[PDB]
Amino acid sequence: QVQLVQSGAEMKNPGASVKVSCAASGYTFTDFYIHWVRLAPGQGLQWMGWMNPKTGRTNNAQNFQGRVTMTRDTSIGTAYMELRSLTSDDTAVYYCVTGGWISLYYDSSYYPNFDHWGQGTLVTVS
Amino acid sequence: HGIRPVVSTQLLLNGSLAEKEIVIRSENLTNNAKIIIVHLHTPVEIVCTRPNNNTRKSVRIGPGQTFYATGDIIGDIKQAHCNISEEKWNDTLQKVGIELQKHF
Amino acid sequence: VKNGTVEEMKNCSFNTTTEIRDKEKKEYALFYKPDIVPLSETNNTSEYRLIN
Amino acid sequence: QSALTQPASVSGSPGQSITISCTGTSYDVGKFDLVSWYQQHPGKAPKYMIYEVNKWPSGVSHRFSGSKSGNTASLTISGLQAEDEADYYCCSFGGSATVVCGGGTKVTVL
Ligand SMILES: *[C@@H]1O[C@H](CO)[C@@H](O[C@@H]2O[C@H](CO)[C@@H](O[C@@H]3O[C@H](CO[C@H]4O[C@H](CO[C@H]5O[C@H](CO)[C@@H](O)[C@H](O)[C@@H]5O[C@H]5O[C@H](CO)[C@@H](O)[C@H](O)[C@@H]5O)[C@@H](O)[C@H](O[C@H]5O[C@H](CO)[C@@H](O)[C@H](O)[C@@H]5O[C@H]5O[C@H](CO)[C@@H](O)[C@H](O)[C@@H]5O)[C@@H]4O)[C@@H](O)[C@H](O[C@H]4O[C@H](CO)[C@@H](O)[C@H](O)[C@@H]4O[C@H]4O[C@H](CO)[C@@H](O)[C@H](O)[C@@H]4O[C@H]4O[C@H](CO)[C@@H](O)[C@H](O)[C@@H]4O)[C@@H]3O)[C@H](O)[C@H]2NC(C)=O)[C@H](O)[C@H]1NC(C)=O
């Protein structure tokens, strides 16, 4: 029932920015966080940032801080992430992942329950 | 007794308990202006918390003395709140009801 | 960030007298909204005072 | 090393259980126990196997299990099969509210 359909392979040159989108269904989109993870070849899973679709707060790992920005719109129910200062090492597969459940009373951003995964986009540089 | 110098306005926190029954106390229950104290037989547990993860900033103000203030919220923004077990609060409130009935 | 039942605070930047008593620097700190009041009849919505 | 320390090798055979370990700093996964493990077949998105060190979600086989102690958290595969030919990624609470993931362990029917 859950599905996160994503954009296509956004091949781009170094120096520019790459913007990926993942459209959500099944889950009530405002209820669950969206985390982002990256499979850089050679390296393992590499985590970029979370975003609260209900509030809009975002954070990034120190490798990505200041380099990644995110946005969405809850009516359509689609999520976006954009990466600045693209380079060759960013050639990787981006994956849009959701969970845990958002609450006003206990923080559950960092709770790494990547419940459902989108099919991917092959970002290639270049 | 080891009296608690507790600061609390609408509810009494970590206080002492009555030995056998819930108690009500007031200088004159006829007056609408006078406060009425209620003292419980068993406690009703309350838990409060800040889910916001503050970081303590250290600002310097003049000769050496520091002024501390909230820095960034390292984490997601969340609501500070309190909790009470609903059924136990209902039971305690209805029992204070029976004790209010003895005077009304 | 959208407001609501989240208890958003105000990021207030202000000048301080540093350890060099007759010299100053800009400094920032986050204060809860009840701690903060709009300034004065010389009205500017972007400028504030502590409630004291 | 970097991010999360994790092995990259196989140490078992079909029908035998295999245990895999994960580690960061004491500020990292050793703090809370917020851990999860994922399983990636080639050309597929990683599936969701273990969460909070010792729990698992619906639809997942009972074979997988895990534990932690101090700064080390581990995943245990029970009775390897041919379906286990995959890569297994550790992920956990990353400190300063971040989340991090490790290099990944290849698994085979060796
Ligand atoms: C103070 O106080 C306060 C209060 O007052 C508090 O707060 C709180 O807290 C708590 C604690 O934590 C919390 O809790 C949480 O919760 C969450 C949520 O839950 C909920 O929800 C869900 C969902 O729902 C939805 O959907 C459905 C379908 O499905 C539908 O139908 C409905 O309706 C809903 O809807 C939506 O939308 C709408 C629109 O309109 C609206 O209306 C609504 O509202 C919404 O929004 C659900 O599901 C749930 O339920 C469940 O659960 C419960 C509990 O447990 C139970 O009871 C039930 O029954 C169910 O169950 C389950 O399970 C079982 C077992 O056996 C089974 O059988 C069944 O079937 C089911 O399945 C509710 O309702 C949640 O989420 C959480 O939990 C989670 O997480 C955690 C953390 O991480 C963990 O630990 C756990 O374990 C879990 O996990 C899980 O999940 C997740 C997600 O969820 C994931 O991630 C993971 O992985 C896992 O998974 C699993 O499961 C799932 C399900 O869920 C599945 O799917 C899968 O596959 C697997 O299997 C928790 O619980 C709460 O929330 C809060 N509140 C608020 C308001 O916020 C505080 O805290 C205090 N403080 C202090 C300091 O103390």
Ligand SMILES: *[C@@H]1O[C@H](CO)[C@@H](O[C@@H]2O[C@H](CO)[C@@H](O[C@@H]3O[C@H](CO)[C@@H](O)[C@H](O[C@H]4O[C@H](CO)[C@@H](O)[C@H](O)[C@@H]4O[C@H]4O[C@H](CO)[C@@H](O)[C@H](O)[C@@H]4O[C@H]4O[C@H](CO)[C@@H](O)[C@H](O)[C@@H]4O)[C@@H]3O)[C@H](O)[C@H]2NC(C)=O)[C@H](O)[C@H]1NC(C)=O
């Ligand atoms: C409370 O309020 C206080 C203020 O009173 C806040 O403190 C301030 O917070 C600011 C934001 O974090 C911070 O500004 C930053 O300072 C650093 C200093 O090193 C500076 O480098 C930053 O500059 C980048 O960001 C600004 C926008 O903020 C951009 O306009 C600027 O161009 C810079 O972006 C470029 O460089 C980045 C690396 O620095 C790149 O990652 C980024 O992609 C971008 O790249 C460009 O070039 C690329 C090609 O090379 C291209 O691909 C790309 O598209 C771009 O063109 C920034 O100015 C203040 O320093 C800070 N001040 C103090 C006193 O702390 C505080 O955060 C508030 N707190 C809360 C909780 O709200």
Ligand SMILES: *[C@@H]1O[C@H](CO)[C@@H](O[C@@H]2O[C@H](CO)[C@@H](O[C@@H]3O[C@H](CO)[C@@H](O)[C@H](O[C@H]4O[C@H](CO)[C@@H](O)[C@H](O)[C@@H]4O[C@H]4O[C@H](CO)[C@@H](O)[C@H](O)[C@@H]4O[C@H]4O[C@H](CO)[C@@H](O)[C@H](O)[C@@H]4O)[C@@H]3O)[C@H](O)[C@H]2NC(C)=O)[C@H](O)[C@H]1NC(C)=O
């Ligand atoms: C609520 O807020 C509080 C306060 O912010 C949060 O607690 C804080 O959490 C911080 C962690 O995010 C923690 O910071 C640590 O500070 C120490 C200095 O005292 C510092 O050493 C730590 O940095 C190392 O560890 C982190 C992981 O925790 C690594 O990501 C980092 O890269 C550092 O490790 C690197 O250096 C080690 C020593 O050389 C190496 O062994 C290690 O392999 C790693 O090497 C790689 O990175 C190098 C660059 O760093 C690179 O050059 C090298 O080549 C390798 O690639 C860390 O920053 C605060 O101490 C802590 N504060 C308190 C008061 O608790 C709390 O988490 C928040 N709550 C929630 C729920 O998040």
